[PDB]
RNA sequence: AACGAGACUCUGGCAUGCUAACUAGUUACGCGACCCCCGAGCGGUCGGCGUCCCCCAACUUCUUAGAGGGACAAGUGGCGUUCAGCCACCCGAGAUUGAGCAAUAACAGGUCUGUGAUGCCCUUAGAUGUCGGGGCUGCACGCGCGCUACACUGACUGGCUCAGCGUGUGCCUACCCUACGCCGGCAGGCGCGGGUAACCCGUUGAACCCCAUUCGUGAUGGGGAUCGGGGAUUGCAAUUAUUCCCCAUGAACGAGGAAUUCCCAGUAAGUGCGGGUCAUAAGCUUGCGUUGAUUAAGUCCCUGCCCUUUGUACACACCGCCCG
């Protein structure tokens, strides 16, 4: 995500800008096993603010 | 070879035999290069030779195919004028008639005295354009 | 990838190394050592690669170095 | 021939440098003969690095100038292949020996520069490097063909091959051998 | 009282408003902004971004 | 060019040679790995420097006495 | 031979002539009034441009997986000089390409196959590689 | 001893080492199908061309992103007090690939029209707080940033062939990106389908460039200003022409005074594209690819800056100060 915008409010003086960036990350682990023990063990044992999305099927 | 003739006169403008046929014809007003490469092909003649190599029989046909374009199946959209306005038809206008037609539409827009004719008579730009930094004759 | 030009240098650079690798794996050293001396003599990036790629633009210019005109009056 | 590239048809053997001064900045055949003039884009990151690359390539580089022709090195090579072709039909030589004479005959022997005294223009005569001579001579003759074909029916290829003849045999019908002698005529005066 | 109070605002620079106070002039939409560039800067520290380049 | 060593390098380089004189070789790579184990240098590029100066000192210490 | 082997400048100039002999291609009436793209400033010099373009149509279908009237135009489009404004790319005509592909399909050298695009008939693929060797027979590859 | 410098963060450049992948590929067959004998042979087979078929196949080189390693003036030769360092060379990616962050003290610099930040003053019902219309585009003139041009190293018409950074409806309040089919010269219309996105658009089938015709040194077919008529799209509304398209009209301009700007390697220049603003619309700005030179390896001459010494009637500091 890029945001390239003025560094000066009410533009005056030498023309300057500022690059901000956010880096997202995705990665996924595919399991094939009963849906019970997965949904049991998955939602627990997570310390940080990190999201998880369980899917019924994809393959 | 082919020493027969060169510069000639046709309707209202003198056309040289020096240049290629299509490009030679364009000098006559109301005919652009795009308009001529059509009319030559409806006439079914070469455009790969000079205008001084055309015969009198051939050029007699050219002006007929030109001045009745709808009747030789050149489309209506491909004309200069579609429903002129207050004349009721599709038309194709050529050299000295073009100027006469043009001067009428100027006169008309000062007759009604719209914004148009006033800008014309004052000698200022008709279309949406700035005149603050555009012009000079004066300075 | 690349344009019309840079592709030509890529296909040359690969076929040069391809030939070498075939000798490096199935034939002895002294076969390919010879071939290495020949190519690297007129080296032109046959067995090596440029590290040069485009630099990133910064503001106040249309290029990375070139700048907009400056007026004092 | 099987161990040393020609030019695609033109021998780089039977090619000499007929000065002892300007060789080791003119070379074309020690192993530096190649099928085409092109580089990977290494030509300069040291002062000595400029010298090494061929004379025929240097000629192609300085041929594309003045805005609309920059970054069109392939179009430029078209003009050079016709040049040698026209030179060979027209006079009949190894057409590289033409070019080597054309470069050597166009390089100045003495040159002037500026020196600041009393807030008024005074000039001083000084000498010139062999590397300077080569750079200057390549510049001068390429300006000729560029100039001539700016309103002539003649193509730049034709103009350029004519310009190498009149340089290779001095005759002062070229833009180069004229402009060479102008500099030296100044260098005599203020010295 | 009145039979009108409003007139079509459905597009343009007047039918969107930025979150300073309903400020404008400073046309903004990006990636779901609706957020004013002056205050965006003050939320460089706040979450959405940390400056790294 | 440039790249004249700073004082942060020259301060710790002397210290590391005084108290671990025995562990030193005169090869770059061996003297690197020793500095990695007898201390932690929190950067990687910094580590590659302090080793190289430790090496360059150890050359001279095998001649007459250093005054630092 | 495969059509890959030969030059392609030569390929079209024999394939265009081939079609016009055999009575193939029912042409549109509009062919002498047609700019041919939005980014041109003139009609073609050529008087048999339709025959030439149908050659280039059938060739690309041999290579790639086949695509409709939209994609053919994108392959042909070029640069548009807008005068005083800076140049930009744009796409050409559509209704010409829509007559080309339907005219080919009348001969069954192409056919609307599955996966959103016309693909060239085995009879078509036979005829391409047949004249591909005729190129090598002619000059000498 | 401390702050700045450096160290640091990000980015580029080196991995057939490590980690693992039908929302990424490759190879291998199994193949069966299509194709042409095109080559040995006969058409089969062997070889060649891509696509479907692909797996319970094999692998991770290519693509992707994580953990690690690698470069240190390390080695050698000169030079230096032989110190700190400097120059050349081997290996090779050479000790500088480009950005982010940045001190003390100051300016009567900009911003009360970013701020439900804010003092004081003013105004507050005949309101400086709402609807309708007009204007910010009005021209005898002066200046700045740019765009397009003055042709043959070109224009024009066909043919061939290559890319990357991104972005996209389910959001603001009514709205996205588009394949495919059909109709139209074109702008465009119409019918269906996909895309929460390494999944669909898009194997982004882009330009310059490349290959073949035509024009001929002619203000020419170079240039496309001005201007007439007609057709579409957005919107509640398009007139002082919103934008887009078609035909016609065809100007200045044929390399530019005094002056002046910017730039050292994938850099300058040429050339296209994405994002930003956006109901409709970039000659702007911000990023990205593609083609890719000439010239330098220096100096204090000009302009300016850092350090020391010196002189001063200056300290509102030479734009200062001061005399008849």
UniProtKB/Swiss-Prot annotation, chain A:
Component of the 40S small ribosomal subunit. This is Small ribosomal subunit protein uS10. Polyubiquitinated by ZNF598 via 'Lys-63'-linked ubiquitin chains when a ribosome has stalled, initiating the ribosome quality control (RQC) pathway to degrade the potentially detrimental aberrant nascent polypeptide. Deubiquitinated by OTUD3 and USP21, antagonizing ZNF598 activity. Ufmylated by UFL1. The lineage of its organism: Eukaryota, Metazoa, Chordata, Craniata, Vertebrata. Component of the small ribosomal subunit. The ribosome is a large ribonucleoprotein complex responsible for the synthesis of proteins in the cell. The modification Phosphoserine is found at residue 33. It comes from the Eukaryota. The modification N6-acetyllysine is found at residue 15.
Curated annotation (Swiss-Prot), chain B:
Keywords: Acetylation, Cytoplasm, Isopeptide bond, Ribonucleoprotein, Ribosomal protein, RNA-binding, rRNA-binding, Ubl conjugation. One of its GO terms (cellular component) is small ribosomal subunit. Disulfide bonds: none annotated. The keyword 4Fe-4S does not apply. One of its GO terms (biological process) is translation. There is a cross-link at residues 86, 89, 101 (Glycyl lysine isopeptide (Lys-Gly) (interchain with G-Cter in SUMO2)). One of its GO terms (molecular function) is rRNA binding. The modification N6-acetyllysine is found at residues 89, 101. InterPro entries: Rbsml_uS13_C, Ribosomal_uS13, Ribosomal_uS13-like_H2TH, Ribosomal_uS13_CS. It is found in: Cytoplasm. Component of the small ribosomal subunit. Component of the small ribosomal subunit. The ribosome is a large ribonucleoprotein complex responsible for the synthesis of proteins in the cell. NCBIfam families: PRK04053.1. Belongs to the universal ribosomal protein uS13 family. This is Small ribosomal subunit protein uS13. The gene is RPS18.
UniProtKB/Swiss-Prot annotation, chain C:
It is found in: Cytoplasm; Nucleus, Nucleolus. Its main location: cytoplasm. GO terms for biological process: maturation of SSU-rRNA from tricistronic rRNA transcript (SSU-rRNA, 5.8S rRNA, LSU-rRNA); translation. Keywords: Acetylation, Cytoplasm, Nucleus, Phosphoprotein, Ribonucleoprotein, Ribosomal protein. GO terms for molecular function: RNA binding; structural constituent of ribosome. GO terms for cellular component: cytosolic ribosome; cytosolic small ribosomal subunit; nucleolus. Disulfide bonds: none annotated. Component of the small ribosomal subunit. The ribosome is a large ribonucleoprotein complex responsible for the synthesis of proteins in the cell. Part of the small subunit (SSU) processome, first precursor of the small eukaryotic ribosomal subunit. During the assembly of the SSU processome in the nucleolus, many ribosome biogenesis factors, an RNA chaperone and ribosomal proteins associate with the nascent pre-rRNA and work in concert to generate RNA folding, modifications, rearrangements and cleavage as well as targeted degradation of pre-ribosomal RNA by the RNA exosome. Belongs to the universal ribosomal protein uS9 family. This is Small ribosomal subunit protein uS9. The gene is RPS16. The chain holds residues 74 to 146 of 146 of the full protein.
Swiss-Prot record, chain F:
The modification N6-succinyllysine is found at residue 19. One of its GO terms (biological process) is translation. Coiled coil: none annotated. Keywords: Cytoplasm, Isopeptide bond, Nucleus, Phosphoprotein, Ribonucleoprotein, Ribosomal protein, Ubl conjugation. It is found in: Cytoplasm; Nucleus, Nucleolus. GO terms for molecular function: structural constituent of ribosome. Its main location: cytoplasm. GO terms for cellular component: cytosolic ribosome; nucleolus; ribonucleoprotein complex. Component of the small ribosomal subunit. The ribosome is a large ribonucleoprotein complex responsible for the synthesis of proteins in the cell. Part of the small subunit (SSU) processome, first precursor of the small eukaryotic ribosomal subunit. During the assembly of the SSU processome in the nucleolus, many ribosome biogenesis factors, an RNA chaperone and ribosomal proteins associate with the nascent pre-rRNA and work in concert to generate RNA folding, modifications, rearrangements and cleavage as well as targeted degradation of pre-ribosomal RNA by the RNA exosome. Component of the small ribosomal subunit. Part of the small subunit (SSU) processome, composed of more than 70 proteins and the RNA chaperone small nucleolar RNA (snoRNA) U3. Belongs to the eukaryotic ribosomal protein eS17 family. This is Small ribosomal subunit protein eS17. The gene is RPS17.
């Amino acid at each position: 995500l890029r945001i390239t915008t003025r560094k000066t409010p009410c533009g005056e003086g030498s023309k300057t800008w500022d690059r901000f960036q956010m880096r997202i990350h995705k990665r996924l682990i595919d399991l094939h096993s009963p849906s019970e023990i997965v949904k049991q063990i998955t939602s627990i044992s997570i310390e940080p603010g990190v999201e998880v999305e369980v899917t019924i099927a994809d393959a | 070879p082919e020493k027969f003739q060169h510069i000639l006169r046709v309707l209202n403008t003198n056309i040289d035999g020096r240049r290629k046929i299509a490009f030679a014809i364009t000098a006559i007003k109301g005919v652009g290069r795009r308009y001529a490469h059509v009319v030559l092909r409806k006439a079914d003649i070469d455009l790969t030779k000079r205008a001084g190599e055309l015969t009198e029989d051939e050029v007699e046909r050219v002006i007929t195919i030109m001045q009745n374009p709808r009747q030789y199946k050149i489309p209506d959209w491909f004309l200069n004028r579609q429903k002129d306005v207050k004349d009721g038809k599709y038309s194709q206008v050529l050299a000295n008639g073009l100027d006469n037609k043009l001067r009428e539409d100027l006169e008309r827009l000062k007759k009604i005295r719209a914004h148009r004719g006033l800008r014309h008579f004052w000698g200022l730009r008709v279309r949406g354009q700035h005149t603050k930094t555009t012009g000079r004759r004066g300075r | 990838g690349g344009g019309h030009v840079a592709q030509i240098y890529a296909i040359r650079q690969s076929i040069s190394k391809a030939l070498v690798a075939y000798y490096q794996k199935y034939v002895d050293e002294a076969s390919k050592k010879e071939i290495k001396d020949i190519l690297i003599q007129y080296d032109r990036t046959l067995l090596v690669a440029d590290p040069r790629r485009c630099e990133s633009k910064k503001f106040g210019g249309p290029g990375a170095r070139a700048r907009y005109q400056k007026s004092y009056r | 021939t099987p161990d040393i590239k020609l030019f695609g048809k033109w021998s780089t053997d039977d090619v000499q440098i007929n000065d002892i001064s300007l060789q080791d900045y003119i070379a074309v055949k020690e192993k530096y003969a190649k099928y085409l003039p092109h580089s990977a884009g290494r030509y300069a990151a040291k002062r000595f690095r400029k010298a090494q690359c061929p004379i025929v390539e240097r000629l192609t580089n300085s041929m594309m100038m003045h805005g609309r022709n920059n970054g069109k090195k392939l179009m430029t090579v078209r003009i050079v292949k016709h040049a040698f072709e026209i030179i060979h039909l027209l006079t009949g030589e190894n057409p590289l020996q033409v070019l080597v004479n054309a470069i050597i005959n166009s390089g100045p022997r003495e040159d002037s520069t500026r020196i600041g005294r009393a807030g008024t223009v005074r000039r001083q005569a000084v000498d010139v490097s062999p590397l300077r001579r080569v750079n200057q001579a390549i510049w001068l003759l390429c300006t000729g063909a560029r100039e001539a074909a700016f309103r002539n029916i003649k193509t730049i290829a034709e103009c350029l091959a004519d310009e190498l003849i009149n340089a290779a045999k001095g005759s002062s019908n070229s833009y180069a051998i004229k402009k060479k002698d102008e500099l030296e005529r100044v260098a005599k005066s203020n010295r | 009282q009145q039979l009108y109070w409003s007139h079509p605002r459905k597009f343009g620079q007047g039918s969107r408003s930025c979150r300073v106070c309903s400020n404008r002039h400073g046309l903004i939409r990006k990636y779901g902004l609706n957020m004013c560039r002056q205050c965006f800067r003050q939320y460089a520290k706040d979450i959405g971004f940390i400056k790294l380049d | 060019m440039g790249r004249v060593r700073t004082k942060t390098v020259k301060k710790a380089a002397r210290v590391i040679i005084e108290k671990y004189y025995t562990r030193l070789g005169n090869d770059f790579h061996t003297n690197k790995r020793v500095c990695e184990e007898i201390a932690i240098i929190p950067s990687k590029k910094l580590r590659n420097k302090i080793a190289g100066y430790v090496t360059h000192l150890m050359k001279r210490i095998q001649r007459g006495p250093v005054r630092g | 031979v495969t059509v890959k082997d030969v030059n392609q400048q030569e390929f079209v100039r024999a394939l265009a002539a081939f079609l016009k002999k055999s009575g193939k291609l029912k042409v549109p009436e509009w062919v002498d009034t047609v700019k041919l793209a939005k980014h041109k400033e003139l009609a073609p010099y050529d008087e048999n441009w339709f025959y030439t373009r149908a050659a280039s149509t059938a060739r690309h279908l041999y290579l790639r997986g086949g695509a409709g009237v939209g994609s053919m135009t994108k392959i042909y489009g070029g640069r548009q000089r807008n005068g005083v404004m800076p140049s930009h790319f744009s796409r050409g005509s559509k209704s010409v390409a829509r007559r080309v592909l339907q005219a080919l399909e009348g001969l069954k050298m192409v056919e609307k196959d599955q996966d959103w695009g016309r693909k060239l008939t085995p009879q078509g693929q036979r005829d391409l590689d047949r004249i591909a060797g005729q190129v090598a027979a002619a000059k000498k590859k």
